[PDB]
């Protein structure tokens, strides 16, 4: 049957494994990467954000980006042939069609890729913990580039694809959602920060706890690609940390599972926090604090301080950051400290 | 007695101690107990601190209206700058707690001890016959505490500009930093997030690849972990099956097969990235800030065409214009 | 009343207890502030 | 101060309940013969 022949061909072991999954992955993954690289150098964000956003206009690798669609578009999928662009390509470009393009395509591309892991895992006969792990990055992309703006007024408030264009996404969240004060974002960082620790710490523990299996100094060659004995003293490592930190692993199976857990759990939490910022259900204030600050003018914490930083961020940014609002804030209304 | 001191040195250095109090430890253990003990008391009961030297006390302790998230140990006064403020430099403790004395007692003892902690991470490795360098991995996170607790203050001219010891107090350090240095637009910070993001990434890669390619030795209803005994001779996972899968995910030559090269990379990446992040804060401590692309792209007439770089400047101005409400008396913020 | 043959015993080692408690306590140190709000 | 009335009990049960869980297990594990 052709099917099994179609299969046969696909699951054939090439340089770049295709597989059934590839039928979804490669089309998308390439289009996403392509659209970005295209907009980054050719399409502008003038009709959309009143911003130059491509090399062709003068932007450098940091300032370039594929900016979101107008706020007028709302949550429109903005299809090349939809009511907006109307089959026209150039217009599509100027209305930020390239955003939902990269967004939606890349989205499927992350599905395809995880499927791939799942498919290749199965073939090679190994456990799918590489796929479970990758759920974490999906969640982030899904909640941040889709769920979030889906809760807001439109795609316009989703993070625009670009380096700097992402920094404002950060600054925004501080200023408007006071995101750094969110229990979930904290867990997020505890995981990414804590995950980048296990990474570094485990790596060094291994390289400096190795057995001598060669006569050279550059001990890299001294490794048996073909299993057998443990290449580093798991027993010595245990005693080291057990004497310098007080606690130390002693079950490589757990030490490695832990390494999957920490950063995947972290990112999952950071996602939930954002799924909540969609509805604006933020972790903005501490009521007991505000009440005391109202009645008593001499009460000051590093918290109150921050909130004022937010007021400034919102007041001085809102104007050129939300053009569709035709904001006009007279100089006299702009919050400012003394002298500055 | 083979000789008291001779013995003492044998104990200190003994590798049979539950916790290896080393030579570096003799300095560590005390400094760290002082830092810790002073902190805990401060954080719980210390009174308001005139951090900005403008007689406007910022209370940051639990008993004075703070909760875990807001509370912090506030930095020494700006009236003090970089001057040394040991308790014996104050007419009284009341005066010492008001000018943020506890802050210095803590940062100095901590930084001192955390260094020896590094010196120790070497010593024990020596007494145990293992290669050094682990302590060099720990040089990155340490080199950061240093950058954030000492270099930045030295550079800026005051300890009051060092990162506070508290959750929210830290966010303050960040938000303001960004405004005065535009760090997000600095190569070193970016390398920093690459290392941290990357680390967590790789940490997950390794973690999964390995855990997923473990040799079966456990029941269907038995923790897959038991399939490992402390003090094994051979390996507990098929690093050849691991490489087999990962090599097919991307492509063979883009995959590790040498556990030693894998683990070097695993350590090298984050440590190198954080080293740069620490050098970023230590560098922006002398006002060599991030890229300033404000009003770069301008049109044919001279009009200013904004880029995301500009939308970033507005958000920064908001921070600039609002931080330290009452501390400025002049136009330029040179401090 | 035939002794149901689908049951196994349950286990939690000491280390797990510790890892467990460390998690419960710190989460509590992290969320109490927002509970008292 | 002006905090939430249920905050205390929310934090108490948040710590007790699951801790009590683990503990029940650990002890019943710990006392299993051989």
């Amino acid at each position: 049957g052709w099917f099994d022949i179609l299969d046969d061909w696909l699951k054939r072991d090439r340089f770049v494994f295709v597989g059934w999954s590839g039928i979804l992955l490669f089309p998308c993954a390439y289009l996403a990467l392509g659209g970005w690289l295209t907009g980054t150098t050719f399409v502008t964000s003038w009709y959309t954000h009143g911003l130059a956003s491509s090399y062709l206009e003068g932007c450098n690798f940091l300032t370039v980006a594929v900016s979101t669609p107008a706020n007028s578009m709302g949550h429109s999928l903005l299809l090349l042939w939809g009511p907006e662009a109307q089959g026209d390509f150039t217009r599509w470009c100027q209305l930020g069609g390239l955003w939902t393009f990269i967004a939606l395509h890349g989205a499927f591309g992350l599905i395809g890729f995880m499927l791939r892991q799942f498919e290749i895992a199965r073939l090679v006969g190994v456990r799918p913990y590489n796929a479970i792990a990758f759920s974490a990055p999906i969640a982030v992309f899904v909640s941040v580039f889709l769920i979030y703006p889906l809760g807001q007024s439109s795609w316009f408030f989703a993070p625009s694809f670009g380096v700097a264009a992402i920094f404002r996404f950060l600054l925004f969240f501080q200023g408007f959602h006071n995101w750094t004060l969110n229990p979930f974002h904290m867990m997020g960082v505890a995981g990414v920060l804590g995950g980048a620790l296990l990474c570094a710490i485990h790596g060094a523990t291994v390289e400096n706890t190795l057995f001598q299996d060669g006569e050279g100094a550059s001990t890299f060659r001294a490794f048996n690609p073909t299993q057998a004995e443990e290449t580093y003293s798991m027993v010595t490592a245990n005693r080291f940390w057990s004497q310098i930190f007080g606690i130390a692993f002693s079950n490589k199976r757990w030490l490695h599972f832990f390494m999957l857990f920490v950063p995947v759990t972290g990112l999952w939490m950071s996602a939930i926090g954002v799924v909540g910022l969609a509805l604006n259900l933020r972790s903005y204030d501490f009521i007991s604090q505000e009440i005391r600050a109202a009645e008593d003018p001499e009460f000051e914490t590093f918290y109150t301080k921050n909130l004022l930083l937010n007021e400034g961020i919102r007041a001085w940014m809102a104007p050129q950051d939300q053009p569709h609002e035709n904001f006009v804030f007279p100089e006299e209304v702009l919050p400012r400290g003394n002298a500055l | 007695s083979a000789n008291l001191w001779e013995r003492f040195c044998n104990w200190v250095t003994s590798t049979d101690n539950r916790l290896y109090v080393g030579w570096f430890g003799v300095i560590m253990i005390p400094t760290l107990l002082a830092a810790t003990i002073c902190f805990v008391i401060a954080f719980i009961a210390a009174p308001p601190v005139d951090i900005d030297g403008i007689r406007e006390p910022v209370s940051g302790s639990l008993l004075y209206g703070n909760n875990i998230i807001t509370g912090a140990v506030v930095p020494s006064s700006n009236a003090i700058g970089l001057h040394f403020y040991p308790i014996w430099e104050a007419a009284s403790l009341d005066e010492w707690l008001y000018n943020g004395g506890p802050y210095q007692l803590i940062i100095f003892h901590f930084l001192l001890g955390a260094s020896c902690y590094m010196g120790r991470q070497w010593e024990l490795s020596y007494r145990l016959g293992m290669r050094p360098w682990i302590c060099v991995a720990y040089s990155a996170p340490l080199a950061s505490a240093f950058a954030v607790f000492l270099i930045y203050p030295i550079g800026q001219g005051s300890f009051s500009d060092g990162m506070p010891l508290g959750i929210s107090g830290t966010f303050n350090f960040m938000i303001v930093f960004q405004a005065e240095h535009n760090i997000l637009m600095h190569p070193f910070h970016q390398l920093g997030v690459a290392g941290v993001f990357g680390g967590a990434l790789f940490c997950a890669m390794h973690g999964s690849l390995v855990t997923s390619s473990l040799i079966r030795e456990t029941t269907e209803t038995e923790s897959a972990n038991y399939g490992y005994k402390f003090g094994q001779e051979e390996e507990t996972y098929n690093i050849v099956a691991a490489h087999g899968y990962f090599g097919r995910l991307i492509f063979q030559y883009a995959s590790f097969n040498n556990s030693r090269s894998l683990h070097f990379f695993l350590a090298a990446w984050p440590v190198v990235g954080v080293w740069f992040t620490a050098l970023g804060i230590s560098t922006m401590a002398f006002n060599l800030n991030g890229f300033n692309f404000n009003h770069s792209v301008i049109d044919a007439k001279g009009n200013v065409i904004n880029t995301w770089a500009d939308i970033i400047n507005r958000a920064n101005l908001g921070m600039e214009v609002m931080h330290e409400r009452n501390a400025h008396n002049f136009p330029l913020d040179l401090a | 009343m035939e002794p149901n043959p689908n049951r196994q015993p349950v286990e939690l080692n000491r280390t797990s207890l510790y890892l467990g408690l460390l998690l419960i306590l710190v989460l509590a140190l992290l969320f109490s502030s927002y509970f008292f709000n | 101060m002006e905090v939430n009335q249920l905050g205390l009990i929310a934090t108490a049960l948040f710590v007790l309940v699951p801790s009590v869980f683990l503990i029940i297990l650990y002890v019943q594990t710990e006392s299993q013969q051989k």
Binding site: - | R18, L62, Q232 | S32, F36 | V15
Partner: peptide, 30 residues
């Protein structure tokens, strides 16, 4: 009331620390 709750949990984590370092299951070989 809040202060007490914050310090208590902290005091509990330090207690844990102690027991974890000094009352772990001795790590046995082979």
């Amino acid at each position: 009331m809040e202060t007490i709750t914050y310090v208590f949990i902290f005091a509990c984590i330090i207690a844990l620390f102690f027991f974890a370092i000094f009352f772990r299951e001795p790590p046995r070989i082979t």
